[PDB]
Design a protein around this ligand. Structure first.
Ligand code: TRP
Length: 333
């Protein structure tokens, strides 16, 4: 039972990525009944992003984040997409059996087209580059290259797996059945983490809390959460500030219940914010020490990534030779 996930290397992870993705995934990859695959989608980074060191810095920070949070490379095959040349070969092969209409309907592309039309732009493809048009095929290669059974994705990403199933089927039928049809994996128990202003925490919203900061900075961050004008003795209900959902994401059911009655008995916001930052700090204190260790010694991350690549390519090449033979690429004998 092979479980496979791609993560972007396009920025530095925040608390929201920790609660909603990283922390659940690290726990979930400990199941001995699954084989665990996680890669950095660094070649997806050049689809749109362009800053010189953005990919390299986000790669180092995303790799250090997952490591610092307990991702075990002895358990998880952990690698950069840019260290698997087989994926790029597979990407061309799948391109040859993918219908253009499938890419016409890819959501990211439909959004670029509608945004031109929302902006009075009568050319639907204005500004569209082929990375945006074709990345669903590369994502399919990322998955099929290792014949993943389950691909843990958000709701947002469900189309992308359904597209891989579509391409896998068409390859299987045109050539031969080499690709298992991958399956979405969704956990309806991960609460997405709210930001400082009530909305879901997201880099594009400017409502994020950094994941890797010292206590005093984590405190100053927490002190920006929207509160209300209730008095240090006034009854505070939990639905009144995002602070409560923040405290909740870092506390047992019992502690949050205690926090509720604490608020209900008239805990001031300054103390509440103070307690929330401490919970966050307490959960993160050790991880933050490992993150600083790794980011200060990146060659340790590079070693781990090379060992991952070595493991990944061995299984990539086993499948690719089958695929190469199925599409007619064969030695002269
Ligand atoms: N496209 C995904 C990341 C990703 C790339 N390739 C993948 C393959 C499998 C799962 C996820 C991925 C995202 O935007 O977050």
């Amino acid at each position: 039972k092979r479980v496979l996930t791609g993560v972007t290397t396009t920025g530095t992870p925040h608390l929201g990525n920790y609660v909603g993705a990283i922390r659940p995934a690290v726990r979930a990859a400990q199941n001995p009944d699954t084989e665990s695959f996680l890669f950095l989608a660094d070649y997806h980074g050049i689809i749109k992003c362009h800053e010189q060191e953005m990919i390299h810095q986000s790669t180092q920070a995303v790799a250090a984040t997952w490591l610092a949070c307990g991702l075990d490379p002895e358990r998880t095959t952990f690698y950069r997409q840019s260290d698997i040349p087989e994926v790029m070969e597979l990407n061309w092969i799948l391109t040859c059996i993918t219908a253009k209409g499938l890419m016409n309907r890819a959501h990211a592309y439909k959004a670029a087209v509608q945004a031109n039309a929302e902006n009075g732009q009568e050319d639907p493809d204005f500004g569209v580059e082929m990375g945006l048009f074709s990345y669903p095929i590369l994502m399919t290669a990322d998955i099929l290259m290792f014949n993943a059974n389950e691909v843990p994705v958000g709701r947002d990403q469900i189309q992308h797996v359904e597209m891989a199933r579509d391409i896998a089927g068409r390859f299987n039928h045109r050539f031969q059945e080499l690709f298992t049809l991958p399956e979405v994996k969704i956990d309806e128990n991960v609460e997405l983490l709210v930001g400082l202003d009530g909305r879901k925490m997201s880099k594009s919203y400017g409502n994020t809390i950094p994941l890797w900061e010292n206590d005093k900075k984590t405190q100053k961050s927490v002190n920006k959460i929207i509160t209300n004008m209730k008095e240090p003795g006034e009854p505070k209900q939990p639905d009144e500030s995002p602070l409560f959902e923040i405290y909740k994401a870092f506390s047992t059911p019992s502690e949050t219940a205690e926090f509720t009655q604490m608020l209900a008995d008239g805990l001031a916001w300054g103390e509440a914010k103070k307690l929330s930052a401490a919970k966050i700090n307490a959960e993160l204190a050790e991880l933050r020490e490992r993150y600083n260790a790794l980011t200060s010694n990146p060659s340790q991350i590079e070693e781990i990534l090379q060992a991952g690549a070595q493991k990944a390519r061995k299984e990539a090449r086993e499948l690719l030779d089958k695929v190469r033979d199925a599409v007619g690429i064969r030695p002269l004998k």
